Amino acid sequence: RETLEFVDPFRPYQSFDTLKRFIQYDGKVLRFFCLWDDSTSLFGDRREFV
Amino acid sequence: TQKHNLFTPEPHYIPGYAGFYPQLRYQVGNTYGRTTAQLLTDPSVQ
């Protein structure tokens, strides 16, 4: 009877969407700063990234 | 009469109607949404 409940359909599916999250967080941005060390290489030393 | 109400504020009035609504005579403003929004937001009489 677990086979006969396996034979008990629902016609399932799954899909996706973007618009609602897209609009909810539309036109916002976080701003953050960071640094990369370079003096490992025998030519470059430092440079800064955002 | 002994019945219900209608016209819920702001969110109200989809485009299409025929029938009077208060102070629709000053509608330089354009979108039906803002029209109706101000229309209900101005019940200021009392």
Binding site: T3, L4, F6, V7, P9, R11 | -
Partner: protein
């Protein structure tokens, strides 16, 4: 080496193949996922008759599934073995059928045929040497008939040297469901009798009777029906993939079984059916296997040959028997009723004995018979077609499709020819 490619046609054949394939696989020891579990040398060797080999031990079936309704194949893929089936062999159209045979035979099949032919010839060249093809389909279902007629017709001249084993389900003599079933069945059988060589015809009324007789649960499903029929075809296919002092090839069976070109119709029969309590109330012995095999209630394909007579019979056993018991049982039946067969031919008995008993038991069997008993069935369809044709109701669709009633007349002619030759032989 020798392999087989399976055709799973129309919605009936779709679920038939579902049950059939899962039955073969579960007997043969392959998981639903694909990673076989090492138990049995002999299956591990003879798997190549059906299953081709991917990497890692995961096995592709050599089956082609076709239908027109996408939801049918969606459900089939949803079953526990869609993952053991391939998208490659999933092909389909867009239009609903209506189960109109002319629709299936002249308008949309006319363009659906080419792609399936290309794919099947891809696999046929992938393999080495086939002996033929086994087809699972319906003659009372629209799409199956309308498509399979064209398919068998064309493959016949594709390769004229292979066996067209056909497996077609038959409508109920008490309720035909599809009201245009007379037309569908007649048109289909017209090309059936031409192209096919061997055909098994299956009617589910006897299945319902056997559900009230030995299945004894009274609350069944078409799944259980498929269980039984799938087991029967399993039994007919077992001899190839297994050792033993017997002959296996479908041709070794057919050339023995059929005397004349126009004799094609066949009667599946099964072996010990076990009820609620007959498990521990039964002794599985040669006399009782023989008896139950020959039993009339046991018979489940078309109808009792009590009205008629036998022409040929074949039986395949699977177990640790000896030749003497089967020979003496054959003599016992021959001399118990030496009248119900035909004096034309002696020795109407054909035998095969495999040494690899199925999973769960120790000896089993299967019975196939050619008897003058399908006369009543195609006679019934004769009255159906005539009593409809006298006033050409519903014919406006078929005329709009664009053929003539003359073609119908030749179909009924061929049908009556089969009737006449069966009668003229037996009597």
């Amino acid at each position: 080496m020798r392999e087989i490619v399976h055709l799973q046609a129309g919605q009936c054949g779709n679920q038939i193949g579902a049950k059939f394939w899962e039955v073969i696989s579960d007997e043969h020891g392959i998981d639903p996922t694909g990673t076989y579990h090492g138990d049995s040398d002999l299956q591990l060797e003879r798997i190549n008759v059906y299953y081709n080999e991917a990497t890692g031990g995961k096995y592709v079936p050599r089956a082609v599934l076709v239908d027109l309704e996408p939801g049918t194949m969606d459900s089939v893929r949803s079953g526990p073995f869609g993952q053991i089936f391939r998208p490659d062999n999933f092909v389909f159209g867009q239009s609903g059928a209506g189960n109109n045979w002319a629709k299936g035979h002249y308008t949309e099949g006319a363009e659906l045929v080419d792609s399936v032919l290309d794919v099947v010839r891809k696999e046929a060249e992938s393999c080495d040497c086939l002996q033929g093809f086994q087809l699972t389909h319906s003659l009372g279902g629209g799409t199956g008939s309308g498509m399979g007629t064209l398919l068998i017709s064309k493959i016949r001249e594709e390769y004229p040297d292979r066996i067209m084993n056909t497996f077609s389900v038959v409508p109920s003599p008490k309720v035909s469901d599809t009201v245009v079933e007379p037309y569908n069945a007649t048109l289909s059988v017209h090309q059936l009798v031409e192209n096919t060589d061997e055909t098994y015809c299956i009617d589910n009324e006897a299945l319902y009777d056997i559900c009230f007789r030995t299945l004894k649960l009274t609350t069944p499903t078409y799944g259980d029906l498929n269980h039984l029929v799938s087991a029967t075809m399993s039994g007919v296919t077992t001899c190839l993939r297994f050792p033993g002092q017997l002959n296996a090839d479908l041709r070794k069976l057919a050339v023995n079984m059929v005397p004349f070109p126009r004799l094609h119709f066949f009667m599946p029969g099964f072996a010990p059916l076990t009820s609620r309590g007959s498990q521990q109330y039964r002794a599985l012995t040669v006399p009782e296997l023989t008896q139950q095999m020959f039993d009339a209630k046991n018979m489940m394909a078309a109808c009792d040959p009590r009205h008629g007579r036998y022409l040929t019979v074949a039986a395949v056993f699977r177990g640790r028997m000896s030749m003497k018991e089967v020979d003496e049982q054959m003599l016992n039946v021959q001399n118990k009723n030496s009248s119900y067969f035909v004096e034309w031919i002696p020795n109407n008995v054909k035998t095969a004995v495999c040494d690899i008993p199925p999973r769960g038991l120790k000896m089993s069997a299967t019975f196939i018979g050619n008897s003058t008993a399908i006369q009543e069935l195609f006679k019934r369809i004769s009255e159906q077609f005539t009593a409809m044709f006298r006033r050409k109701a519903f014919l406006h669709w078929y005329t709009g499709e664009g053929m003539d009633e003359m073609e119908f007349t030749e179909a009924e002619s061929n049908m009556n020819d089969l009737v006449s030759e069966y009668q003229q032989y037996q009597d």
